[PDB]
Amino acid sequence: PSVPPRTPQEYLRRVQIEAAQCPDVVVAQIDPKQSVNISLSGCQPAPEGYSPTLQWQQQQVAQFSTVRQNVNKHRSHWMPKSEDEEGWKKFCLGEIGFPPLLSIVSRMNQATVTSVLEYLSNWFGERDFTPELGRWLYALLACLEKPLLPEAHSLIRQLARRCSEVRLLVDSKDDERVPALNLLICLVSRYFDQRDLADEP
């Protein structure tokens, strides 16, 4: 009672009893700043008119799926080195360079598919968008199996960001680039689940 305790289980009963008399939760009112966490940007919206309609977006996504099925037929039938940024750039784009034939993309493993995408993004930041570039990106995207690594998700968002910026330079929809850019943006944004980047018109 008022003694102290002599065995532990007693003490513990003692402490337990005490702890049920305590309030369970306790809020203390106080009387009176923050760092910032950088965060990478969304896509740049499309100039007025340049935005593709939902049915077109859904048309390609569907279409792109089917394409990726085909890609696994060849992939059953089985080049610069994986780390060769320079030779991969040359190989694909050239000066010309090699197109993306199933022959070739079907021989590339995923870690390479990924690398290469990186290289063509680093080329794309500092050079202009050709149609040749266009095919490659689209191919490497058709060779990317999922579920994607986080690192790979970040890559293709970077790439889609880089497309939307370039789309602001354009001055007529007649530009060759516009369709290609809208596509890649749509595929990352809808096929690869990054719908924060999507062009909801």
Binding site: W56, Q59, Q60, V67, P99, L101, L102, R135
Partner: peptide, 17 residues
């Protein structure tokens, strides 16, 4: 069709209307 991809791409671009 070893160039199915290059073809698919062009069809897809092209299909913009």
């Amino acid at each position: 069709d070893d160039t199915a991809l290059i073809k698919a791409y062009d069809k897809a671009v092209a299909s913009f209307k």
